[PDB]
């Protein structure tokens, strides 16, 4: 969705309804903004460099939070205080308590919108990135439980009868042998090193390509056997009592699944109210950009005639050409006030 907002001052407010007579172009809504504080000539044109930067900086913040909508579960449900973007564009007005008109419009009204948008930009970059870390560790949850017997954790293949306790003179090592060299390892598991148990070869779990077995040995002959296991294409992985901490990591797979869900409703309630505040902040900054450059392009007896427009699709070449003739006799880019906004979020 696109949008175009153009003011055309000098009755004069009845010629804005004549643009609604061209039914193929726009509906030409009013979208009145209240009277603001004037009284500056140097600071009026000096604010035009700051208001252009504020309109572009606040546009990228709300467009970066709309990209985060795909991570919570394309979706267009971002209402602005129980109101759609099209329903707010036909009923747009000043808040007068969040953007006060008693204060100065150039400096003070913009700084209250600037400091509010900068805090919401800070709270969206600092808080939402922390929830990506618990989801980044959740990417490593299935990564520890994927692949063959070597790449997978042993949280589900554990058994108390598969290892030798009282390890003062014994040690149980989880060895992996391929399916093609299983018979070659069965005749060589006892002859890999000295003082090896020749009958403890028990395949606990097997895969499609290899088979994981247990091999008991002494405490001193664990290193020379594993060095000979690399020559005999046998994969020996270390084992310890951290499976009870991997059972705590089996609960941490459910704790991070709980930490994702407990932070889902908290962040979706945060993105629903902050993006609606920032989209109304860019809407207030566009009207500040529309209140500016209208008292300089047109005369300032008291105040210029306020007017706005509505969106259009595929007839903008005919809409700009039909407005080119009515605006070329006004003056001596476009010949009048024009600000191209993007009604779409993505």
């Amino acid at each position: 969705t696109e949008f175009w907002l153009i003011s055309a001052p000098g009755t004069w407010e009845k010629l804005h309804a004549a643009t609604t007579k061209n039914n193929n172009l726009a509906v030409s809504s009013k979208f009145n903004i209240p009277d603001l504080k004037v009284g500056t000539l140097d600071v009026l044109v000096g604010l035009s460099d700051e208001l252009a930067k504020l309109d572009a900086f606040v546009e990228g913040v709300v467009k970066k939070v709309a990209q985060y909508m795909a991570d919570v579960l394309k979706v267009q449900e971002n209402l602005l205080a129980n109101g759609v973007d099209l329903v707010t564009y036909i009923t747009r007005f000043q808040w007068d308590m969040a953007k006060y008109p008693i204060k100065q419009s150039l400096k003070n009204i913009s700084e209250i919108i600037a400091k509010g948008v900068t805090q919401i930009d800070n709270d969206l970059k600092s808080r939402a990135s922390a929830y990506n870390n618990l989801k980044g560790n959740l990417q490593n949850l299935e990564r520890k439980n994927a692949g063959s017997l070597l790449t997978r954790s042993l949280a589900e293949i554990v058994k108390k009868d598969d290892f030798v306790l009282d390890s003062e003179y014994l040690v149980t090592l989880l060895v992996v042998v391929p399916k093609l060299n299983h018979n070659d390892w069965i005749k060589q598991y006892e002859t890999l090193a000295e003082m090896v148990v020749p009958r403890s070869s028990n395949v606990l779990s097997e895969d499609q390509d290899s088979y994981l077995c247990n091999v008991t040995l002494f405490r001193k002959a664990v290193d020379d056997f594993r060095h000979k296991a690399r020559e005999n294409k046998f994969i020996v992985r270390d084992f310890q009592y951290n499976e009870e901490e991997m059972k705590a990591d089996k609960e941490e797979m459910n704790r991070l699944s709980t930490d994702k869900k407990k932070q889902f409703g908290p962040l979706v309630r945060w993105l629903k109210v902050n993006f609606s505040e920032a989209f109304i902040a860019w809407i207030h900054v566009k009207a500040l950009r529309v209140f500016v450059e209208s008292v300089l392009r047109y005369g300032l007896p008291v105040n210029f005639q306020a007017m706005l427009l509505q969106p259009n699709k595929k007839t903008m070449k005919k809409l700009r050409e039909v407005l080119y003739e009515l605006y070329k006799h006004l003056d001596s880019y476009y010949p009048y006030v024009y600000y191209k906004i993007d009604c779409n979020l993505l």
Binding site: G136, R230, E231, K233, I235
Partner: protein, 348 residues
């Protein structure tokens, strides 16, 4: 039609360089290297390969700067053996591989000249493949790069110096603009030489030389953001060789942003899915670690053809990855930082 010939002159050497493919380390050879805990034990696990008894004479304190220098002196004596037995359709091709190292040594030989040095940088500080032990007038040319540039035209890099006048390298151009303008003229002359040799060596090699012109189209325009070289200065650094030539190089010379080089790689579906390095994550592969997985994917595909010259260039660029992988295993072992020890490229 190139198959019933090509065993006349190049039949013994092709079977030799495919015998050196069987010595390139497999995945199971790497999985025994990552279990090593000291560089003294890496000397043991490398002896079960074909590398064996190559570090048996150095020292008992085994540092990583000896393993790196002894690995790459084994690739030189395997390349120099296949060049000294080469015949002229293949010896002209094997000299085109050494021009990527003659370019990296000529530039090293003019920095000492601009800073008034001599042959003391020549012997210890140059790559042995592109080496100047003949053309002995280079070895005594102490002249400040004007009577020395008249000696570099007595060198096989003479045909590439037709875009670098001797006044340009005399402090007029940056030392990397002299590199990549020679490397632009090197790839475009090596692509034409690999097109004259037609048949199997023009369809198993020009896909490799197209990606090499698109690596240096993407990596140059990404590293040219903060520096002071204009868009017309990097448009003459793009080699006119790759897939990106009439259209991507028109957009890459106007980029000014990393997001403007990401949506010009989206037009080419081989280069998107390679632009998913995405270094905002703490631990993952970057862009050039994903361009190295594609450099060796095209290099393994050259061994699926048989009667062609591309089996020799795809061995030098896969024995160079051996000197980058085993040193990376050795540099994560000597520092005991082996959590990123799996960030190598598993070639075979």
């Amino acid at each position: 039609f190139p198959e019933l010939y090509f065993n006349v002159d190049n039949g013994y050497l092709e079977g030799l360089v495919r015998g050196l493919k069987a010595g390139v380390l497999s995945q199971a050879d790497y999985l025994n290297l990552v279990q090593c805990e000291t560089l003294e034990d890496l000397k043991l696990h490398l002896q079960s390969t074909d590398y064996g008894n190559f570090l048996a004479n150095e020292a008992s304190p085994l540092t990583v700067s000896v393993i790196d220098d002894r690995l790459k002196e084994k690739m030189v004596v395997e390349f120099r053996h296949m060049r000294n037995h080469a015949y002229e359709p293949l010896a002209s091709f094997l000299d085109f591989i050494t021009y990527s190292y003659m370019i990296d040594n000529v530039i090293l030989l003019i920095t000492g000249t601009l800073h008034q040095r001599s042959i003391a940088e020549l012997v210890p500080k140059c790559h042995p493949l592109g080496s100047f032990e003949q053309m002995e007038a280079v070895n005594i040319a102490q002249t400040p790069a004007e009577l020395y540039n008249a000696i570099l035209v007595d060198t096989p890099l003479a045909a590439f110096f037709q875009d670098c006048i001797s006044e340009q390298d005399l402090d007029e151009m940056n030392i990397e603009i002299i590199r990549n303008t020679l490397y632009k003229a090197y790839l475009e002359s090596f692509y034409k030489f690999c097109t004259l040799l037609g048949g199997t060596t023009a369809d198993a090699m020009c896909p490799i030389l197209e990606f090499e012109a698109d690596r240096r189209a993407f990596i140059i325009t990404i590293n040219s953001f903060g520096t002071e070289l204009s868009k017309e200065d990097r448009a003459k650094l793009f080699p006119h060789c790759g897939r990106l030539y009439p259209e991507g190089l028109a957009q890459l010379a106007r980029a000014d942003d990393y997001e403007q080089v990401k949506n010009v790689a989206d037009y080419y579906p081989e280069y998107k899915l390679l632009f998913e390095g995405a270094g905002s994550n703490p631990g993952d592969k970057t862009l050039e670690d994903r361009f190295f997985e594609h450099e060796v994917k095209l290099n393994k595909l050259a061994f699926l053809n048989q009667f062609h010259f591309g089996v020799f260039y795809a061995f030098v660029k896969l024995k160079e990855q051996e000197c980058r992988n085993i040193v990376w295993i050795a540099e994560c072992i000597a520092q005991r930082h082996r959590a990123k020890i799996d960030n190598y490229i598993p070639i075979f």
